[PDB]
Amino acid sequence: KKKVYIVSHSHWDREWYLPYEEHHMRLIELVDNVLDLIENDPEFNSFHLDGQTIILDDYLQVRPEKKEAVKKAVQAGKLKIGPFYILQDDFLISSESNVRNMLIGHLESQKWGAPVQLGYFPDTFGNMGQTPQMMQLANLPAAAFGRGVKPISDYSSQYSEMWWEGPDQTKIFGLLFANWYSNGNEIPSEKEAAIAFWKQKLADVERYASTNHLLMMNGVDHQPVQRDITKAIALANELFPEYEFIHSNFDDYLKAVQEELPEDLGTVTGELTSQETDGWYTLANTSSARVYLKQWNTKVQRQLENIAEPLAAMAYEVTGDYPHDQFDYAWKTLLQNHPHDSICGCSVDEVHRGMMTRFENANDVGHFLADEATRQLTEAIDTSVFPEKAHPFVLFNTSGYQKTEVVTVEVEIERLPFYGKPEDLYHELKQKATPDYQVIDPTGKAVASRIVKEDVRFGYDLPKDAFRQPYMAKYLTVELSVKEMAPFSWDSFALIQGETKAFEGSLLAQPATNEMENEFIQVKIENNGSLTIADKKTGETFSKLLTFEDTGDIGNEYIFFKPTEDQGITTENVTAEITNKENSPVKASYQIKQTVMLPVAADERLEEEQKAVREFRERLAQRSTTLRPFEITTMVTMIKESNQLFFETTINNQIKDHRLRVLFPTGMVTETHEADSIYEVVTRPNQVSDTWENPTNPQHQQAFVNVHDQNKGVTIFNEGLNEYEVLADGTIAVTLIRCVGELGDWGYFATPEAQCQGEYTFKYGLSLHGKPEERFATYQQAYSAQIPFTAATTARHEGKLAPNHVYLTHAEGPIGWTAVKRQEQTNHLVVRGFNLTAQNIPCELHKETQPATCLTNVLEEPLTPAIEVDAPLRPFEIRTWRFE
Amino acid sequence: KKKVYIVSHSHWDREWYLPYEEHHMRLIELVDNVLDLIENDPEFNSFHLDGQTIILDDYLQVRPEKKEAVKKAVQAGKLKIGPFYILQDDFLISSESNVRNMLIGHLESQKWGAPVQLGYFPDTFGNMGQTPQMMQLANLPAAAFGRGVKPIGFDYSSQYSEMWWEGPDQTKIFGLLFANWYSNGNEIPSEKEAAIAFWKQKLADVERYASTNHLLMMNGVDHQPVQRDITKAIALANELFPEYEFIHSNFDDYLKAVQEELPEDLGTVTGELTSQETDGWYTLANTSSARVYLKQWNTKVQRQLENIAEPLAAMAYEVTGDYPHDQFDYAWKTLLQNHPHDSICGCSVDEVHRGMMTRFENANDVGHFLADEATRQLTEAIDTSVFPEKAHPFVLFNTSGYQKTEVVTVEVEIERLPFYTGKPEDLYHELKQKATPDYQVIDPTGKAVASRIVKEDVRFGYDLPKDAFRQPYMAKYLTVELSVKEMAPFSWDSFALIQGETKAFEGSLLAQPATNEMENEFIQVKIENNGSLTIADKKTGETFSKLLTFEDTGDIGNEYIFFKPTEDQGITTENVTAEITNKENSPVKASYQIKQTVMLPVAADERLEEEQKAVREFRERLAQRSTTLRPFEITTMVTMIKESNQLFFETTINNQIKDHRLRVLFPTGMVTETHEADSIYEVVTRPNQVSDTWENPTNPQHQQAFVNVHDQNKGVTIFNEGLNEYEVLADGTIAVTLIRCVGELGDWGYFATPEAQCQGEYTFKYGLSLHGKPEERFATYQQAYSAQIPFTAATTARHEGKLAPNHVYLTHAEGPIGWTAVKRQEQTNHLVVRGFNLTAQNIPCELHKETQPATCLTNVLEEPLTPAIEVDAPLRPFEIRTWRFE
């Protein structure tokens, strides 16, 4: 007798085709009915709460008196919660954000009960290759998913269950929804309807079954709970005597199905990105829907992971405090924008306007905590090493890499409180002469710098023990050339009156020929605005870089689709206006201004094809014949002590139904390329499979993408530009912005704000390298470019902290450093990194010559079995350190 | 020996010059330190939590594991909470929103312990006239305030910092004035020398206006951290000054002590406290026009909850036995979070107000969901089998307490092709190509109702059933126009759409397009080439000219204050060639489009930015309007229906202009001593003659739904939706401010607010109503309330039901009454109805529900009055009466 396990559930997208509160109020009805069945049906086994604990919070936010009832249902085993906080899109959120989803979920779960030990990815558009290791590092032995593997090729499976092995050889139990998570939805309680139902549903599940234990998912998207499931199940037990129907849960099913597993069970390895399909519904183009959401997500994630948390971790040694609740609050606010329908940008306009508010709030909490930690650190630094009348300031490197930047610091040099007319103080500082200032180090040695600008403006202080104090102040912005600042360290300086020590050496730019060069590269800006770069260390030359391409797009927020007759417009034949904006021995910058006459939108045919829900592949709309100027302004910046070229493109988008890309021809036709993923540098082929029909192959990227051979290589890094494609000739095409007018999917939902009108700024850059070992240096500096330097002023005072201090000594090598924070109750220092290579490398951490206490998992629990702190870093290993 | 009562507090603006979370993270630090003092310092008496309970909620959402500590702090009487939910602006939120603030503040305070029984208005920009009655109707016998009254010593001036406050209904409460502001006791020195100079000054300031030997020192200020050494400083004061007894105390103990020794010569203030006897420069009344989109959304969401969702849900309880109390509490708290004075006044930074829009969207969507749930539940219970087969029935609800007259539009689905039938694009074009039969409207009897088919539409649609998956389909919709005449209050009428010859409206066309004229049985409208209106009251014989004139001037002030540049003399549409086009014309409804293009300065000149950065006082600002001009088009839709004297206006602009204010003018033609305006449960009488101390060349006043000017023979009423700033000019011209654009926050520093320039598309809804005898003015007020409450139309299928096709849910005592609430009590589910008298006379007011009288009259907290008032007792002047039906 084959047992059939029926698990009641409801896949709840938090916000999608309706505004958030429209879904939120229907979530109240769902949970109300779930609790009613629990309290009134003694034969109701359990209800799976979609693997996300936030549903409990969203429910009790409206019905708080139900907390005790909700708690009892969880403690009785009838309401199965966890283990995640929300159901995220893996590729569109940061590596740490994926970990915090499990960490927050693990901590939120212990307010109710033991969560389900199952990774829940039912609707995730592609699954990250590091899922097995990340699951195991969070005490999750199994994972349930629905996309990425076809049940019956490297990405197929003869069984609905399988083994899933990551690049670090960590293996978990893969549970595929081979007939989707809706095969058991709406089970009939009538004879003639139940016979025809179970005759095909039992048939559909036994094609891919490897055991006598079948899985029937009793729910679907926003599905109300089947209130007569007990009657339908009891009816099924009487109509099919060979099968045994059991209202069950995932925990009992996982235990049962894995007891009678066969020996010939298959194994999938690495990413699961639907690479063996027709490529028409990968939904990868969600990486380009509403680019402003991805940019805000990148900025807030860096603010929390790489700014506020490291600084607050350092400030703990001064205060003995760590704002755990504030950080937890900021992370849950940020994670509320990480449901896959939210961060992918495939919802209605009101949903994404609401995401901007959450982005702002989480960012502001991140700035507040970073400013508190920075004040606590600088106030404890012994700045009395500087002469009197000096203006101290401290630079913080909050990353795990050697940092090389030309930074600016704004130092207040005079202050006039008003408590007379405040306007007199303004004009007083306005008419006061500004002396020559000079930067010095703690020893009094003059540091080279440049006085950029001065500003007189209103300001105020918010003391922790007194009323607000307003003032009029004068500020000097000083430019510094920081060369290879040690990771997780700080350096103190000061402004004093005196002749400024100017930068020395040859100018980086040669403006008459529109050229730049340092010791690494020689850059030439051609007439069309493209870049010709020569690698001075390898001798390789690259041409036609930074070409901009614009084509039409008549798809939706999920899928890009070029009009059939659209050839695209590029800047290859345009005539760029090139201006050298800055030129110093340490920094040079050019402004490239280009214009292309683009179609204002799609022609009038697209609207009727959208309203009629015509499939995008059958759409005949072309680009409009009415034109409108489209201006592209790009800044190209080069500094003396780095091989990275930095790009900053500005547009005021008034064009609809189009996609803008920037092109980097590498001249290398290779089998594979490399992209930044989740705790992984994933290798991907450039040749689509035999079943692939999409003329494009959009792919997800985090921080960079790379194409290289045995001699040379090009690394393109970005900020919030998560969609790329490697063309046939080896050209790296990064998508800047993609504008559509409808949601897509199951109906017609107009989304005009998905046209992304208004001003935008895209930050990206390139880095050349030679032998394949030199990739990882460009990978680290790609991570470092996303992390800004932290500078803050402070007065003269004594203190227990030295003016220059290295907080963490990191093992040099191909390692990505992603987290520095402190554990919840213990306040132990937590550091997390991961191996960039497939090789065992030495990795030893030290905090002021003190070794780490032990290695932990991502939940900051000690590893079992224990790994030695000085043990080599295994290939693709995610390692977390604990310092007491 | 006098007693010095030191009350520690912190006036906490939830969001102001910083983004919300920047203030919020500092709120966590404050409450952490207050709990530190409460749990450790044995001499720390208590801490007054700014009169708002939302501080407890905002603290626990970041630190939930501190809830037991907060409970113990409140249970110990050391954390003084309530009685409000938030500290609101009085005039800029609806009448019910003021009551919901007290109702939720009470219910929340009871969850922790009990509220401080003191009305807390420390920084409210003007106080509503009905404050004493509203305080008394919430079990609050006293109110502490800071603005509106001037202390003297030895009309709106008091010799003492204690006074009696009598409302228009003669309800009288005890008034506690912060005569030396709520910061006189801030940062008490804990050192000998500093304490002497401090108290020698502070004691003399408080004694200037003390009517008793009990003195109030407010130990706190805006966003002030709690004074950690307050215990030490108080003991030092008792040591240094033997003639005084310094006590760390609280408002409960102070109020009991000061009112026990109150002298008989105590002064009494009556009505509004709007700083009438000041110089008029710092009323901050111009906040009512700052960021008008906030006021428009607030009006929309408030009507959606008070006058749509709650009345429909109260009726839907009859068929379901359920009422979504938790959802309404969630929607109201979300809306009240936009009601702190710095929020709704529009005097914060850009990040704050973009966050308010999210709250408005969320609260509005909950009100829509709850209204659609009640609407579906009611229509599912209506017996629609009375209509013939194949008919498409629909139901019209009047969710207001007034006789409603309106030309209504109803969209009815006539066909539906589900997606499982075939390919979606095939179904779309199949319905598009299918011919449309002529349809006819019928009542349950079968008698044809006059109508007109407006338009047809074929689009995608879906259903979200409560027991199955989503249901997508392609549908065809017909838009039918009905002429509803004096529909009964709180009732519903059922109609149906059958195939047949449509019954057209009969009578003469309301509009005469050859001369740009409209007229019915009440008014005769001429639209001049000027674009202004010349109206003739056909019942009273009066004429009014130059109506609907637009005026734009510069504004170099801030979000608080309007200030015209010294050389600006204004720009008007009085000398402009308008483009007039008749859009609709029928026997029941006609509308005209008026297009006017005027050249406006793009902004102020470059001198304004320097005067803002230097924080120069606005009166000393030399900036003028820019000489660079830019086109500015004004499009107004003037609408008239057959069965109403209301002339509706809809002005739309694409505001690309900065540093200016646009108003619409209505010359009444009569110079009176006083005018009237809609306030909070009150039609307040305001003077046109400006006081002697007043120096502001303008007199901006707050309005809710309307403003009126009348004499003994004629009158003009101007109603609006979210246009809350008005001014009655010296020649009787009513000027309603449409939009006011500034670039800085103002107040204590320089805070650039470019989104306060209100750039983009805007639509202003307002109207005109004429009357004759002064008693006729109250009917225009009711219809002004009724214009803000749209009809609720809903389609349903044919089915038997337990509700009648036509039914009156509530019968109202006809007369000069405003009806503001129909909802149900949280636990008892009793039907709650609230109205108020518009006049100063005792009028009859008997309310019935299905011929059954009310059980008892209650306060605004929905509890029986003590002592009770008979349900058939006459409505007292300016009384706010609340009914309860068990």
3-state secondary structure (DSSP) of residue A54: helix
Q: Searching chain B, which residue's CA lies closest to the CA of residue A187? A: B468
User: Which of B:443-462 have CB within 8 Å of A?
Assistant: 459-460, 462
DSSP secondary structure code for residue A616 in this structure: G
Closest to A559 (Cα-Cα) out of A333, A828, A274: A274
Contact predicate B588/B483, CB 8 Å: yes
Distance between CA B370 and CA A26 in Å, rounded? 11
3-state secondary structure (DSSP) of residue B311: helix
List CB contacts (< 8 A) between A22 and chain B: 365, 368-369
Determine how many CB atoms are found less than 10 A away from the CB of residue A212: 15
Residue B546, phi then psi, degrees to nearest 5: 60, 25
Q: Searching chain B, which residue's CA lies closest to the CA of residue A423? A: B614
Tell me whether residues B327 and A28 touch, CB distance under 8 A. Answer: yes
List CB contacts (< 8 A) between A748 and chain B: 459-460
Distance between CA B28 and CA A329 in Å, rounded? 12
Task: Identify which of A220, A222, A326 has the shortest CB distance to residue B25.
Answer: A326
Structural domains for chain A: 1-277 (3.20.110.10), 284-382 (1.20.1270.50), 390-502+788-807 (2.60.40.2210), 503-787 (2.70.98.30), 808-884 (2.60.40.2220)
Task: Identify which of B19, B187, B617 has the shortest CB distance to residue A360.
Answer: B19
Give buried/exposed letters for B305-317 (b at 16+ CB in 10 A, else e): bbbbbbbbbbbbb
| Cβ of residue B622 closer than 8 Å to a chain A Cβ | no
CA B82 to chain centre: 22
Distances (CA, A) of A566 to A126, A246, A552, A598, B160: 29, 56, 7, 12, 81
Tell me whether residues A612 and B425 touch, CB distance under 8 A. Answer: yes
Give the DSSP letter string of A180-197. GGGTTSS---SHHHHHHH
Distance between CA B726 and CA B584 in Å, rounded? 31
| B731, burial (CB in 10 Å: exposed 0-12, middle 13-18, buried 19+) | exposed
Contact predicate B860/B188, CB 8 Å: no
Give the active site residue among A89, A90, A123, A676: A123
Tell me whether residues B614 and A427 touch, CB distance under 8 A. Answer: yes
| Cβ of residue A329 closer than 8 Å to a chain B Cβ | yes
List CB contacts (< 8 A) between B348 and chain A: none
Distance between CA A703 and CA A644 in Å, rounded? 14
Contact predicate A412/A437, CB 8 Å: no
Residues 6+ apart with CB under 8 A from B99: B134, B138, B821, B834, B860
Beta strands in A93-192 (DSSP E): 119-121, 142-145, 150-151, 156-157, 161-165, 171-176
Tell me whether residues A326 and B28 touch, CB distance under 8 A. Answer: yes
- Nearest CA distance, B613 vs chain A (angstrom): 7
Closest to B555 (Cα-Cα) out of B628, B658, B659, B657: B659
Tell me which residue has tokens 């939902």: A749
Beta strands in B742-855 (DSSP E): 760-771, 792-795, 807-808, 817-824, 831-837, 848-849, 852-853
Task: Identify which of A20, A65, A464 has the shortest CB distance to residue B362.
Answer: A20
Residue A569, phi then psi, degrees to nearest 5: -115, 130
What pairing do the DSSP bridges indicate for beta strands B817-824 and B856-858?
unpaired
Tell me whether residues A224 and B468 touch, CB distance under 8 A. Answer: yes
- Nearest CA distance, A738 vs chain B (angstrom): 24
Q: What is the dihedral of CA B335, B337, B338, B339, to 10 degrees?
A: 100
Number of A:B CB contacts under 8 A? 146
List CB contacts (< 8 A) between A609 and chain B: 425
Contact predicate B205/B226, CB 8 Å: no
| Cβ of residue B390 closer than 8 Å to a chain A Cβ | no
Q: Searching chain B, which residue's CA lies closest to the CA of residue A18? A: B365
List CB contacts (< 8 A) between B225 and chain A: 463-466
List CB contacts (< 8 A) between A325 and chain B: 28, 62-63, 65
CA atoms within 13 A on the CB side of A36: 11
- Nearest CA distance, B98 vs chain A (angstrom): 22
Closest to B495 (Cα-Cα) out of B449, B436, B437, B439: B449
Residues 6+ apart with CB under 8 A from A424: none
| Cβ of residue B464 closer than 8 Å to a chain A Cβ | yes
Task: Identify which of A360, A465, A470 has the shortest CB distance to residue B225.
Answer: A465
User: In Å, what resolution does this model reach?
Assistant: 2.4
Tell me whether residues A458 and B615 touch, CB distance under 8 A. Answer: yes
List CB contacts (< 8 A) between B332 and chain A: none
Residues 6+ apart with CB under 8 A from A453: A476, A477
Q: Searching chain A, which residue's CA lies closest to the CA of residue B226? A: A465
Distance between CA A652 and CA B827 in Å, rounded? 55
Q: Which residues of B belong to the active site?
A: 123
Nearest-10 crossing angle of helices B292-304, B325-336: 170
A243 is in an annotated binding site: yes
Q: Searching chain B, which residue's CA lies closest to the CA of residue A19? A: B365
| Cβ of residue B224 closer than 8 Å to a chain A Cβ | yes
Give buried/exposed letters for A518-553 (b at 16+ CB in 10 A, else e): bebbbbbbbebbbbebbbeebebebebbbbbbbbbb
What pairing do the DSSP bridges indicate for beta strands B448-449 and B660-667?
unpaired
Tell me whether residues B62 and A326 touch, CB distance under 8 A. Answer: yes
Contact predicate B237/B4, CB 8 Å: yes
Closest to A493 (Cα-Cα) out of A533, A428, A443: A443
Distance between CA A624 and CA B510 in Å, rounded? 44
List CB contacts (< 8 A) between A464 and chain B: 29, 225
Tell me whether residues B22 and A364 touch, CB distance under 8 A. Answer: yes
Distances (CA, A) of B255 to A264, B56, B86, B119, B122: 83, 24, 22, 12, 16
Closest to B298 (Cα-Cα) out of B349, B224, B363, B389: B363
B244 is in an annotated binding site: yes
User: Which of B:408-427 have CB within 8 Å of A?
Assistant: 424-425
Task: Identify which of A61, A467, A609 has the shortest CB distance to residue B221.
Answer: A467
Residues 6+ apart with CB under 8 A from A431: none
Task: Identify which of B228, B460, B469 has the shortest CB distance to residue A613.
Answer: B460
Contact predicate B140/B117, CB 8 Å: yes
| Cβ of residue B67 closer than 8 Å to a chain A Cβ | no
Tell me whether residues A356 and B354 touch, CB distance under 8 A. Answer: yes
Length of chain A: 884
Determine how many CB atoms are found less than 10 A away from the CB of residue A432: 12
Contact predicate B623/B565, CB 8 Å: yes
User: Which of B:343-362 have CB within 8 Å of A?
Assistant: 351, 354-355, 357-358, 361-362
Closest to A597 (Cα-Cα) out of A576, A620, A579, A574: A574
List CB contacts (< 8 A) between B61 and chain A: 329
User: Which of A:181-210 have CB within 8 Å of B?
Assistant: 185-186
